[PDB]
Ligand binder design. Sequence first.
Ligand SMILES: O=c1[nH]ncc(-n2cc3ccc(OC4CCNCC4)cc3c2)c1C(F)(F)F
Length: 243
Amino acid sequence: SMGWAAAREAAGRDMLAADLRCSLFASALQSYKRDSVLRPFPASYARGDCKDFEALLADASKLPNLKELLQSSGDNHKRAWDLVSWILSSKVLTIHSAGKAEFEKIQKLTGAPHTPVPAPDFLFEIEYFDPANAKFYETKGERDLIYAFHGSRLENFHSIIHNGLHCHLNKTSLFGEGTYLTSDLSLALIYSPHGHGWQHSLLGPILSCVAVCEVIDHIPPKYFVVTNNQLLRVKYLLVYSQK
Ligand SMILES: O=c1[nH]ncc(-n2cc3ccc(OC4CCNCC4)cc3c2)c1C(F)(F)F
């Protein structure tokens, strides 16, 4: 993972994106489903197979807000900087705050809404690095990209960002295999109830989040299903902050 000085620079470049990542980490950690949804898990809190969730919950509770972490601390917050450095580290991707200009663009790409939908409070774009970025464009070849929504409980988004959407392979289920997506945000939103994020977040403590996926083309509103995880990636996050 990045060292502290590098993490401080990365967080300073985009405080809201860094905050989002700390918020989604807190949501996955605080969930009763932490065992399955906090993946990836920070290795410094694991003894081989044994994940020390109580030590991690305690240290997450001691994190100051990101403004305090950056503006004073250098060696005032050793454990905090170790954890936040890990949260903000990835060789695969990074996240960028985007403007309400970008929400219009998302509507243009997904379709004019058939149903009234709320505008997100925050919008983020995921940028992929190689090899994952080149691999996705290799898989795409000349096929078109379509943009579709996938709602989920807040405590799944740490895993969704780092691992992609779960593409279930269970012929043993009512819903069968695949990832469900829709071009109607009002249908995706039903799958994105408010959850608890981070009490020290710039975004606010209570968030809903909807993924916008890039899919390689290959009443109620209409949904579709993708069974091959190489054919989609999460490209945007729509974040709604409860008032
Ligand atoms: O955003 C989403 N987040 N998670 C789930 C999900 N999704 C939509 C569904 C519609 C219907 C259905 O029902 C089955 C269909 C087969 N037969 C038995 C019932 C399951 C769905 C799961 C969506 C969406 F809208 F993008 F697709």
